[PDB]
Amino acid sequence: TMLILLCNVNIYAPNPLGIKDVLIAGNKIAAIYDHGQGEITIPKQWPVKVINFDGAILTPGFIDSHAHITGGGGEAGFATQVPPVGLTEFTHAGVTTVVGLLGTDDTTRSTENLLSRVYGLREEGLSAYCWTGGYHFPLTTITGSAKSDIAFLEPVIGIGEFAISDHRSSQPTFEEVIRLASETHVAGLITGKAGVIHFHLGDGERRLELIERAIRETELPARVFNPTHVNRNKPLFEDSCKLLSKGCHIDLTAFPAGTAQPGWEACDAIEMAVERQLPLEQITLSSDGGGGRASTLGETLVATLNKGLSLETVLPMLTSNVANILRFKNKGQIAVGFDADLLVMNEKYEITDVMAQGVWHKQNNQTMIKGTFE
C-alpha cells in the first residue's frame, strides 16, 4: 500500500535525531516527528500500513558508487568473466542505489551491456546509475563520446573507472586526462548530474600526480577528480589524505576482511582519517562488487563501530557523502522530501529491513523481493 508509518525508530539521518515516527508516501519521506502511537487517528479510507520498530536504528540506504553490475573479471582469461550481480546481492547488503561501471575488460563488454543492466535493475526496484567510458583510452561509450553519453543517457553520471598509475592502464597523458575531465564537468553543468571522473588507482609510484597537476595548473574544480582504491597501498593513502585539502572526494575500497594486502583495511583507513581530523565529508566507501561483494560495506561499518567509532561518524561515508559528490539531491538522508531508501539495523548492526523507493525488499530479516533469475 502507498503510505507506511514507521513508528518508534532511532534515526541516524545520518546525523542522530533520536526516536521518531516516519511517514512514507509512495517513494518519498513525507514526515518525521516525535514518537506517538495510540493517540494518532488514521482515516479508515486511507491505505496506511503501520509498523512498530521498537526503537531500532534507521539509516539511509547505502549508495555504492563502484559496482561491476554486469560482472567484472576477465583479467585471468575468458573463463574469469564474472556473471551479472543479482538484485539481492545489493539490496541484502543495504545497497539501495548502485552506480555501475566497466573496469579492466572494456574490450569484450560494452556500455550497451552496462546501461541495459542499469535499466534492468531499475525495473526490479533498485535505483541505478552508471559511469561511461571505462578503464582505457580511447573510451568505451554508446554514442562515441563521453560528453554525448552523459548529456543524452539519463543514468550516465560521469566517466569511470578510468585507470591511472596502473600496469593495466592506457598510460594516459595529462592532456588526455584534462580533456576527459572537461567533458564530464561540462556535461554535468548541462545535465545537473555528477560530472565527475572516477579514477581507478593502481600501485604505481606516480600515484595521484596527474590529478594534482590538473588541479594546480587548470581551472577544473577539484571535485571533478574522484580517485578510488585509495587505501590499496600506504603511500597512496597518504597522498590521498593530502589531496583532501584541495577539495576532492576520495573513495576507499571495502576489501574483504584480511585482504588489504600491502595497504590499509578500510576500517583502519577510516580510523586514521578520524584521528587526523581530515574533512570526513569528503571521504566515501565503495564495494567494487562483482569486480568484491557489496556485503563488505556493512562489514566495514561494523568493524569501524567495533573500534569505538560512532555510527554518525562513519555512516555518512556510505550515504550522504556519496550523494553530495554524485549530486543525488534526493538520496543519502532521512529527511523530508528525500527518497524513501532506508535500512533498519539491529543492535549488532545487522541489516534486518531494506526499503528502496518505498517498497520493502527485505523485512524482518526475510527476502521480500528477488531478481528475475535469482
Place this chain on the structure above:
Amino acid sequence: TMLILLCNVNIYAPNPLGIKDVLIAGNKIAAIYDHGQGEITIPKQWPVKVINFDGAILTPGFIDSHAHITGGGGEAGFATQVPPVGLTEFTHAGVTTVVGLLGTDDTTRSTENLLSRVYGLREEGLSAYCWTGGYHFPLTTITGSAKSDIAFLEPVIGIGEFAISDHRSSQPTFEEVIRLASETHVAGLITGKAGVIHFHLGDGERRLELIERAIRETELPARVFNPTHVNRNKPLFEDSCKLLSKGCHIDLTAFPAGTAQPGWEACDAIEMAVERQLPLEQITLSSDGGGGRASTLGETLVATLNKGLSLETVLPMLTSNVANILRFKNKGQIAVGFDADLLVMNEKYEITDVMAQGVWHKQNNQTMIKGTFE
C-alpha cells in the same frame, strides 16, 4: 507539503465514478473514496493540504501524442522556424504529458534538440517523451538507428512523425517502411515502451496503402502502425475508419476551428465515429502544437460536448486511449496507483486547475508555475 486531499470531486476517470474524495500522495493517486459529510481527523503531524471543489468535474490530464516541442515550421523559408513551445502552452491547455517530434524540417533540427527539450520540460514538471526518426528517410536519430535510440534513450518511445502519402515525404518504399516498423516493434519489446511508428499522412491518393499492405502481408501487429492527421481529407478518414477493424489506433488532428476544410473538423469526425458504432477505444486526438496550439484539444472537446456527446465518450480520446497505445501504464486514468496528472473543469468545460505529477500548475484560474523563459 506532499499529501493533497481533493474533496468533493465529480470524477470522470474517464469512466464516470460519481462524487468522490481523492488522496494524492506525492506524484501518485493514493485513494479514491465516497465523499461523506463529516470532515475526518487528519493527524496534525502529517503535511496534508485539503481542498474542497464543490462537485466540480475532475478528469485525467490530457496526453498529447503529437507536438513540435522545439517548434516546427520551416516550410516557407528559414524565417518560419517556430520557437520552442512554452510550458504553459501545454499545462494551461490541460496537457500534462507531451510526446515531441520533428516534422518536415529534420534537416536543420536534430534529435539532440528534441530530446534536450524533452528533458527541459521534465525539469519544469511536465511529463515528456519523444518520437525519434522524424519525417524523412534516412532517419534523423542520435545513435544512428531507431532501434538503438528507442532501446537506450529512455524518453524515446517510437518513430515519428514518418511521412507517407505526402508531396514532402521521402517516397518511402514498402520494404523501407516494414523495416522501420520492425525496428520500433522489437525495441518496444526490449524496453516495454510503445514500439509504434507514428505516420504523418498527407493528401496523397495512395492514402494508407503501405500500412494496409504491411498488416496484410507481414506478421507485424496492427497496433504498430499509428496514422495521424486522418481527418485531413474525407477519403483518408473513410480509409482510416476501415483500418480500425484491423486493430490500429488512428489519430485525429485538432485543427483550429476555422480550418479543416477539405477534410473534417475533429469534432465532426468524432461525432461520425460515435454514430457509426466504431471502436472508440482506438481513436485519439492530438494538437500538432508548434507545427498549431494545444488549446485546440480543449476546444474540440467543448465542441463535441455541444453536439450532445457525453464527456465519458470523448474524454478517452485525450487520455486513456492514448495511454493504451503508447503503453503509458501509469497515465490516462484516475485510479489508485496512477500518476497524479489531473484537471478540474467548470460546468462550461473550461479548465480551472491543472495538476502534473502532484504539483499544481494552474489553480483557481491562476498560473502557479510558468516556464523558465515565459
